[PDB]
């Protein structure tokens, strides 16, 4: 309910910025994403926000990331991190898109009603940790946003350069510090320490054959694997070549490179000088997705994306808990969306055994879903993913008493292993760690990966509609009730061809529906993904009213 010093100083410091045009905001997953220059007020609202989350929870630490990902340079963007570096509350996103939206002139009393709506006590200081990747705008944005947690009175740490994935790591661990499960030292330094540690226990006694050529999208990734690389241990036989890390050139960032290029146009950077069999990795721009690929002996390229992994983890995971003799009391599962290949949910099924839940699409639904389990693996394709363990699983992990070596070994390794994999967001360099133990332990060359089930030939197409909002979807998005029939004719569609899959769903942004379908061969997936195409632009164009 206070205070008039507060209010005073944040609608003075708004007045330093202009709102753009007429510019209406959201505040989606992974926060406000757009054009730099329209920014500033946004940013500023944020650090608003961000003040009265911290003052709700007890004066709890909460995160900002300013970054926009696999973007173009002249973009950025802003997120909030919760107190153990969750994603901010669904129900937060619109507070932060009330703030956004609102004049500037007005700023301080639409504060003023989220105090009221929200009940927040003004006992406790706010207290906001953020960084930034590599983008040129990154020291405008952090201007704006310490402008308004000044204004607000709030405590902060400006953590400078970090992955986002480092910057969920801090958060968590300032949050647990003196508590039961202490996440960590909260430095960039505490980090690559947790990192090492780990990999040296899961690597005991084995090691990584050949290279790995990281393309670090000349992001903020390339820095910090670089400086993890000094605290990794000697004899795992890891030899990391880092590729794409001209930071200092903004124009460089995400320029034919690395993860979303890799996965979206399904081919090598231009740039790569990588020889045939090369183990490759690509990160993304803000280190939070990873893919893998290689050169096969003919020439091709040879894609590993995020079910790729996924299945990887998975098959490790799955042995490592049958080993370790707690499989039967420990719930495993993959957590997949539909657009995951018809043959990696095959494989998880058939030959892992391991159950497979579809759920819808969205980082939000595969996290919630994973966390049902005791080990939930998730990945999407484009490398976004991590393996959630509850409460449950490391306690019958760290009490479990072993009754052979090769019993103990994997309980160890297993207890490692929930050291070494992010618990709060997908981290690139952490899955790069992972998937480079599980080949060691394996002995798989990218190849014998790659052979260990043959996807289904599939094709996403973009189709243009009149109304994205006509089409509504259920069962994890691979059934829609409306329009009327096309679902039926979806189903029937589906079944004219071997091993047939399709869906549609609407992209939920645009006037746009995705289809995706596959198939037993190429010309299958592709007639099917062109035939529901059209059905799809046939029941979204315009209805036509008749006269007399
Ligand atoms: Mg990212």
Redesign the pocket.
Known sequence: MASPAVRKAISDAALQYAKPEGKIFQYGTAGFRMKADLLNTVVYAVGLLATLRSKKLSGQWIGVMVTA??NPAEDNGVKLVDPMGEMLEAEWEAYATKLANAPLENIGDVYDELVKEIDVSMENPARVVFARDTRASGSRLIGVLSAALTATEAEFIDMKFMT?PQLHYVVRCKNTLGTQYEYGEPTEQGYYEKLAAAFKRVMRGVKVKGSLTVDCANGVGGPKLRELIKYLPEDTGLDIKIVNDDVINPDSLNFECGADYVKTKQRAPPSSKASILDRCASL???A??ILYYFLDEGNVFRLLDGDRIATLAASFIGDLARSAGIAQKLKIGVVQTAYANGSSTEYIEKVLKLPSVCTNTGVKHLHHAAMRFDVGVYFEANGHGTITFSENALKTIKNTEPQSPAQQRSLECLQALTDLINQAVGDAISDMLLVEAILAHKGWTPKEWLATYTDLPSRLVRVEVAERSIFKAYDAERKLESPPGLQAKIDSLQSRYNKGRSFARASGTEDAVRVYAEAASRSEADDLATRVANAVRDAGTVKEILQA
């Open positions: 990902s696999h986002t993304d721009g803000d939070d997705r």
